[PDB]
Amino acid sequence: PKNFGLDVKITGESENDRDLGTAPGGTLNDIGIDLRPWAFGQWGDWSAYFMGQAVAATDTIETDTLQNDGREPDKSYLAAREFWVDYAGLTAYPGEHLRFGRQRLREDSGQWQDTNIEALNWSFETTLLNAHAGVAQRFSEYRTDLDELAPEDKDRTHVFGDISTQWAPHHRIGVRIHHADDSGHLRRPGEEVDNLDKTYTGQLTWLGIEATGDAYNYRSSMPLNYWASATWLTGDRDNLTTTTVDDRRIATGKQSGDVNAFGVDLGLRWNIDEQWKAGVGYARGSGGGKDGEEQFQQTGLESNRSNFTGTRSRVHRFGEAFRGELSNLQAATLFGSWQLREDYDASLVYHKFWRVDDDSDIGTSGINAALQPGEKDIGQELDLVVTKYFKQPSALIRFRGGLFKPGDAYGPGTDSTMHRAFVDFIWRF
Ligand SMILES: CCCCCCC/C=C\CCCCCC(=O)OC[C@H](O)CO
Ligand SMILES: CCCCCCC/C=C\CCCCCC(=O)OC[C@H](O)CO
Ligand SMILES: CCCCCCCCCCCC[N+](C)(C)[O-]
Ligand SMILES: [Cu+2]
Ligand SMILES: [Cu+2]
Ligand SMILES: [Mg+2]
């Protein structure tokens, strides 16, 4: 058991243009280094881990796919990524352990949780039955450049769980729950409201079923793989109301409404042979409705990145460029993928996006530009991921790129094309 190491990453990012040319900046053409020293110890059923991070870049690029004066990042910073203790001795099951601290929370779809966060998480993974249960909350960014949490994350508590069984070899059915609460943390009327304050609070519960047949298993022995999930979002959100007096904003009350939304994601992958795969996907997050109540949203812990193309490399489920969130969004996707032993892989993904309700914004982490009322046609995207794995979890060099072609929903004076591309070189010592 290796007690220390150092992960070294060099990243280049090209982005143009996040705002489709409508606002200033929003593009990237830059390079950076990301150094992650780590430490690990193990003593019987216990273990503990720390990973820190030092980054220096020519601009504020994304070196980690998992991510106000207080919220402007610096080109360079130090951070604590993970720090936890783990106990695996409750049961003899090796996939069963309890982890406490800032840790990687992930499920295979990436659509519920895929992030580093302070948490207490119990995992129970066996051949016939998988289960998890945990609680999480952000208390800090643990970063030298960020002094404060984003208001949405502040005092927001997450509680979640899942259970599933393998009813035949490689065919799984399960349910999953997540609840996020930050209710009652709004400014009471009379108080001054800063840029650091919340504009809303919520109590939200996601309830999902999910069936998978080696959905995210790149080494599947089956000729066909699939995923299917349906997720119900319910609860309510209180919207903070304000007024401005003498150049100072101030709380006046709140406006409340129920949330009642629904999301679905379906996919089918043909394992043509040991190297070639192809597939189709469909996903939809409901949108709009009375006071946004039919507006699906995700937990806020998601990456939407997964091995859905059937390779070791994870790919953004809704485009490297568009980076859609499943929110008032319909997407149809087509992909093919290729790999050669453990040395290389590659994926080509096409997406088409539509709005569900043409008078509501969509779910997006990649494009910052206003939509035209009454237009459903968000656009199309083509993505390519290519990776080489070196002999010395493994060193790699990877290209990740997305080309997005905005549809009629973005309208006049917007660029006809936008891209976001990365090259990452990663070496482990
Ligand atoms: C269904 C689309 C799958 C992706 C197709 C586009 C792939 C584009 C470039 C792949 C480049 C991979 C190069 C791997 C390589 O250099 O192999 C060297 C020898 O051929 C084997 O060692
Ligand atoms: C500025 C570097 C940009 C790199 C972009 C990511 C490319 C990722 C994989 C492409 C691999 C192409 C070269 C493959 C290679 O090095 O072959 C070496 C083998 O020993 C030949 O069999
Ligand atoms: C080289 C290992 C890096 C570990 C150091 C991580 C420190 C980041 C947290 C310190 C607090 C930063 N803050 C909140 C004051 O801005
Ligand atoms: Cu711009
Ligand atoms: Cu098997
Ligand atoms: Mg155990």
Author numbering: 39 to 105, 116 to 440, 454 to 490
From the article:
In the periplasm, M is randomly epimerized to G or partially acetylated, and the mature alginate is directed to the transmembrane β-barrel protein AlgE in the outer membrane for conveyance to the extracellular space. The loops and turns range in size from two to 43 residues, with L1 coordinating a calcium ion. Both the N- and C-termini are in the periplasm. The cavity within the AlgE barrel has been proposed to act as a pore for alginate, a random, linear copolymer of 1,4-linked β-d-mannuronic acid (M) and its C-5 epimer α-l-guluronic acid (G).
The best crystals were obtained with 7.8 MAG at 20°C. These yielded three crystal forms in space groups C2, P212121, P21 that diffracted to 1.9, 2.4 and 2.8 Å resolution, respectively. For all in meso structures, type I packing was observed, as is the norm for crystals grown in a lipidic mesophase environment. Interestingly, we find that L2 and T8, while ordered in some crystal forms, are disordered in others. Disorder, where electron density is either not observed or is ill-defined in the map, suggests that the corresponding loops, or parts thereof, are flexible and, in certain cases, may have relocated to reside outside the barrel. In the case of AlgE-2.4, which has two molecules in the asymmetric unit, T8 is disordered in molecule A (AlgE-2.4A) and is ordered in molecule B (AlgE-2.4B). These two crystal forms are interpreted as examples of the alginate pore in which its periplasmic gate (P-­gate) is open and closed, respectively. It appears therefore that in this collection of six models we have an ensemble of structures that map a conformational landscape for alginate transport. We refer to this as the double-gate model.
